[PDB]
Amino acid sequence: MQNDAGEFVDLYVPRKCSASNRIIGAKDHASIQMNVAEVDKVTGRFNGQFKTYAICGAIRRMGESDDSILRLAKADGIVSKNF
Template sequence: MATIGMFNEEGENVDLYIPRKCHATNTLIEAHDHAAVQISIANVGSNGVIDGTTTTLCIAGYLRSQGESDHAINHIAIDRRIVRIKTGKPKRASKSKSKKPATRGAAAGGAAAQKGARPSAQKGARPPAQKGAAPTRKSRA
């Protein structure tokens, strides 16, 4: 782990203030941000016993005031593999795919006719517009 701050010849830290960074937003936590918190989470071994080490998370006051600190802590804990999440329900066996019977009022193309749409055989019907196509002009005769 890298040392932070300024040290004298005896190896003592002589800085008056060591800045912290928010682990969620990666922004500096200022000295006058009194809403910011630093949380230490105890690390647990595979048998479920605390092993004596901790993981420290810093959360800025801005996130806390917006009500997003719980989401940020969960996201960081999952990224650092402090917390494992289960992937939901197991996959179910897929049902056999069979065609559904045609519904009443279906168009000839197999798709249901849009309610209120005018039939394509009606006089003055235009083909659907295409993206990027030039507008059609009426010829003068």
């Protein structure tokens, strides 16, 4: 995104999907941004640490987006590993 001097020349850096690793377009209204809450370890209380994920529109209209969110929650470690 650079030049030879070093100054940032592009106007923004677009997002990429967490499942297909494709660039989310500015007019792709099928794309999502979802927030999932992190809980305290012993109490079971919501404190506010957030770990958001984005899915591009093609994966969502494919029918395999829930599996993508399931694999992201497997990778982060919040949902149980035995499953």
